[PDB]
């Protein structure tokens, strides 16, 4: 059993901070979109659907920001203690939060980037409040990587089960069995120390921060597009 | 503190079976609805949204049905064993929350706006059932978590925190009532099976009402 360190507390907080950044990017751009949509009578109910989603994200964000990791980690004394927590036990609920969030983003992204996009064109006969292609790319790229990071955490510590499986990961696998390179199908290497998890974690952290900045940048571009094409006066 | 028994394996499987019944009720009625919606041109994209939801529920159901509880239980704390079950419930419950709002509120209004055809709407009674079942699965979920003191900020249900924050600001409601702690597994098992009886009662009422709506959709459109 891999064991906790005093440094474990901050590793969890750092992982959760990414999740909070991911949630917050969406909440900011959605708050804007919801405000613009107030002025479009034909999109009244689609707007309420978005509010429901954004509320859920906002709640996950308050939950994550209020979580004091140290209050749930028994810690290392120096190293010996058999009542100190397993690293397994400590990562498990973090991973589990990521899974819940990732599945929520999956539902939202389909609505936001596909259905609603088509509905907006059908109802309004223009592109003024659609997303940009590049924002959709970013959305999907960020999702994919958070899915893969989530899978890494779970499979690296061998803490997975049927209940922590991500829909998109199982779909990719079942599709490859039936069909005869894809990020979801690549193998997770197990990890043996916490020092190793930490190292790989911080490398993931760097990658994901990179994706979230690209996302932020594209959300800024669309918010501007919405301003220029719809919000401003004529 | 509290420890596993050989009987623990079956207690988990029984809890999970409820979740599967809840998921399966929705999947059946949604499959029917999605088929009827094929014939309404103006509801083409709402239909694809429902497909996305139903796929998610279907996946949670396969996940739950494939879970062999004994493969994850030994010796283990009862805490440790219930935690991922409770955690699945929470993920599912928050999914149902999203879906219920879409299905019973937004989409209902949209259907009337686009079609004025009440043959495509849900019955008021099916909505009542949906909400009643949700409320009880939320409360059961909270019971499992708070009874064993395994909760945290991350396992909080949005609807439960909303009720609490609303009572603080305003100064009887199912979500605000207190969960008594449990001290033995024998006690958890007893209360669990009483919950099981109640929730099965709600799911049969739900099934009844999903039948009624499916029958309406059959008679008023059909094959």
């Amino acid at each position: 059993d891999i064991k906790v360190t005093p440094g474990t507390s901050e590793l969890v907080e750092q992982i959760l901070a990414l999740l909070s950044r991911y949630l917050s990017s969406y909440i900011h751009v959605l708050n804007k979109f919801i405000s613009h949509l107030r002025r479009v009578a034909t999109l009244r109910f689609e707007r309420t659907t978005l509010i429901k989603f954004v509320k859920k994200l906002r709640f996950y964000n308050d939950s994550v920001l209020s979580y004091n990791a140290s209050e749930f980690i028994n810690e290392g004394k120096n190293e010996l203690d058999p009542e100190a927590d397993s690293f397994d036990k400590v990562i498990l609920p973090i991973a589990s939060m990521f899974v819940k969030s990732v599945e929520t983003f999956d539902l939202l992204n389909y609505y936001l980037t596909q259905s609603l996009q088509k509905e907006i064109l059908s109802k309004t006969l223009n592109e003024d409040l659609t997303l940009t292609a590049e924002s959709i790319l970013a959305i999907d790229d960020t999702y994919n990587h958070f899915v893969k990071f989530s899978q890494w955490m779970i499979e690296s510590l061998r803490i997975g089960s049927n209940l922590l499986d991500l829909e998109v990961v199982q779909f990719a696998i079942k599709s490859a069995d039936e069909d005869g390179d894809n990020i979801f199908l690549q193998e997770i290497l197990p990890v043996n120390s916490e020092e190793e998890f930490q190292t790989l974690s911080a490398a993931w952290h760097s990658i994901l921060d990179g994706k979230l900045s690209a996302l932020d940048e594209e959300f800024d571009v669309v918010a501007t597009k919405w301003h220029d094409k719809f919000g401003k006066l004529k | 503190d509290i420890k596993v028994t050989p009987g623990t394996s079956e207690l988990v499987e029984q809890i999970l079976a409820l979740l599967s019944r809840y998921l399966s009720s929705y999947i059946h009625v949604l499959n029917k609805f999605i088929s009827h919606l094929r014939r309404v041109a103006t509801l083409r994209f709402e239909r694809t949204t429902l497909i996305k939801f139903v796929k998610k529920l279907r996946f949670y159901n396969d996940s739950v049905l494939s879970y062999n509880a004994s493969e994850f239980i030994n010796a283990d704390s009862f805490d440790k064993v219930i935690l991922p079950i409770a955690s699945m419930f929470v993920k599912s419950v928050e999914t149902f929350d999203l879906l219920n709002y879409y299905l019973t509120q937004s989409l209902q209004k949209e259907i009337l706006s686009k079609t004025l055809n009440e043959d495509l709407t849900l019955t008021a009674e099916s909505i009542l059932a949906i909400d009643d079942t949700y409320n009880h699965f939320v409360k059961f979920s909270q019971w499992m978590i708070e009874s064993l003191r395994i909760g945290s900020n991350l396992l909080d249900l949005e609807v439960v925190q909303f009720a609490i924050k609303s009572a603080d600001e305003d100064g009887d409601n199912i979500f605000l009532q207190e969960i008594l702690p449990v001290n033995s597994e024998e006690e958890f098992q007893t209360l669990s099976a009483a919950w099981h009886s109640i929730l099965d009662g709600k799911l049969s009422a739900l099934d009844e009402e999903f039948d009624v709506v499916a029958t309406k959709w059959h008679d008023k459109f059909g094959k």
């Binding site: 992204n109 999907d140 998109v168 779909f171 997770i188 290497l189 990658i207 | -």
Partner: peptide
């Protein structure tokens, strides 16, 4: 491919702890 569009609306770095050809 009509089933695959419910999982991404989109038609090569190393990732930490992910063996590359697998």
């Amino acid at each position: 491919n009509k089933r695959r569009s419910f999982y991404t609306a989109s038609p090569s770095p190393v990732l930490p702890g992910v063996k590359r050809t697998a």
